[PDB]
């Protein structure tokens, strides 16, 4: 079996630079053998070269593709911000086809700290027995971002789940959500909700916070 | 204008049976190779089966003697018949045309199956009202659902920019919750309305919420 490893298993490039993809085989792949697909988060993967080096239809002339033998290398010329995804090798040299492992490709740009917003939790869902406080930390680079909450000045622990968009084509920023669960009860014995965001484009941490019934 | 449009995915209990199909337009299923990939949770790209134009079948070891793909001429349309689901299958599944024995070359759009035995369950939905404390931000908070995926839109699709839906997180208790989020001009709140529209096919559920200011 033709394994394929490609190299790096992450890439992180600022739009503008060149990025080059390696996918090196086990084995000699006959006849250049050789596709290249690229999957966007959510989408179906799409084929970007095959047979080594012909550009499919309608790809753009940013990527091309190389190599020859068990050494093959899909180059990005110039990185655009829609670029980020997983791109995956495939070999048609010998049965079973085989593909890489994939080389995920992100979107560098220039740091962005996030604007920060705390929602209550609802009447509505206070009637039903819980209560969702939820910090939104929205449009910033990189994604690395720390989230505390407190509540009546007590950090909490174990309470809270964080979710993170993938990248914003446009402007290669992120958005997280973190919310804190409690139940109802819990909520009304306290007064002051308060998220706290450190992230290197703040030069110090922002907290965000809201007295309970104003 | 190749076109390869998937249905058939969803909930389905272990030990039970599913039949995905595609339709396709712009070449004749019959007179092609044609494939199933799957591509479970977070990994890589796996063959799972492939006709030849001249009927052949082969399968990958994991399901061989329980899948079986074939072709209606009549309907130019693959299907995927399966068996003996197990959570290991849980997978978004594409089809793809393949040319010849070589390389994928368009794909479907791929459609995600659920081995579980746990029971479908609809969101409840809570808004994340705009207020002071958060250009402003609202929300909908689509809480505890089963399975994947819900669907969100803001104001029936007229509303695109500046929406995030975060990816969705599964809670302790086994159902899933995310949030959808949109930055609307602050001067807006009062004059527009605004409408999450919740989609859920799993429970054949759909709940508009309106986001009005507290």
């Known amino acids: 079996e033709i394994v394929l490893t490609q190299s790096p298993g992450t890439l992180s490039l600022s739009p503008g630079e060149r990025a080059t993809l390696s996918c090196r085989a086990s084995?000699?792949?006959?006849?250049?053998?050789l596709a290249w697909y690229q999957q966007k988060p959510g989408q179906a993967p799409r084929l970007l070269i095959y047979?080594?080096?012909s550009r499919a239809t309608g790809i753009p002339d940013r990527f091309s593709g190389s190599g020859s033998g068990t050494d093959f290398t899909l180059t990005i010329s110039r990185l655009e911000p829609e670029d980020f995804a997983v791109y995956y090798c495939q070999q048609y040299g010998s049965s079973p086809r085989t593909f890489g492992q994939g080389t995920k490709v992100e979107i560098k740009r220039t740091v962005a700290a996030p604007s920060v917003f705390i929602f209550p939790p609802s009447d509505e869902q206070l009637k039903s027995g819980t209560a969702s406080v939820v910090c939104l930390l929205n449009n910033f680079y990189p994604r690395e971002a720390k989230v505390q909450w407190k509540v009546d000045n007590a950090l909490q622990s174990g309470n809270s789940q964080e979710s993170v968009t993938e990248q914003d084509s446009k402007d290669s920023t992120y958005s997280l959500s973190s919310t804190l669960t409690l139940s109802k009860a819990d909520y009304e014995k306290h007064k002051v909700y308060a998220c706290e965001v450190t992230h290197q484009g703040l030069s110090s941490p922002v907290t965000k916070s809201f007295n309970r019934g104003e | 204008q190749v076109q390869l449009v998937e249905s058939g995915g969803g909930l389905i209990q272990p030990g039970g049976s599913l039949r995905l199909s595609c339709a396709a337009s712009?070449?004749?299923?019959?007179?092609?190779?044609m494939s199933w990939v799957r591509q479970a949770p977070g990994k890589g790209l796996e063959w799972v089966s492939v006709?030849?134009?001249?009927?052949?079948?082969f399968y990958a070891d994991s399901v061989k003697g329980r899948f079986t793909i074939s072709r209606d001429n009549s309907k130019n349309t693959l299907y995927l018949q399966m068996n003996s689901l197990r959570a290991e299958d849980t997978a978004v599944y594409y089809c793809?045309?393949?040319?010849?024995?070589?390389?994928?070359?368009?794909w479907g759009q791929g459609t995600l199956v659920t081995v579980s035995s746990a029971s479908t369950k609809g969101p409840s939905v809570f808004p994340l009202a705009p207020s002071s404390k958060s250009t402003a931000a609202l929300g909908c908070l689509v809480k505890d659902y089963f399975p994947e995926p819900v669907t969100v839109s803001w104001n029936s699709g007229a509303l695109t920019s500046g929406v995030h839906t975060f990816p969705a997180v599964l809670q302790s208790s086994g159902l899933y919750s995310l949030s959808s989020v949109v930055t609307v001009p602050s001067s807006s709140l009062g004059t527009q309305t605004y409408i999450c529209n919740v989609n859920h096919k799993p429970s054949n559920t759909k709940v508009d919420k309106r986001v009005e200011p507290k």
């Open positions: 006709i030849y134009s001249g009927g052949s079948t």
């Open positions: 793809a045309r393949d040319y010849g024995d070589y390389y994928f070359d368009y």
């Open positions: 084995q000699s792949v006959s006849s250049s053998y």
């Open positions: 047979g080594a080096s």
């Open positions: 712009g070449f004749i299923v019959s007179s092609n190779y």
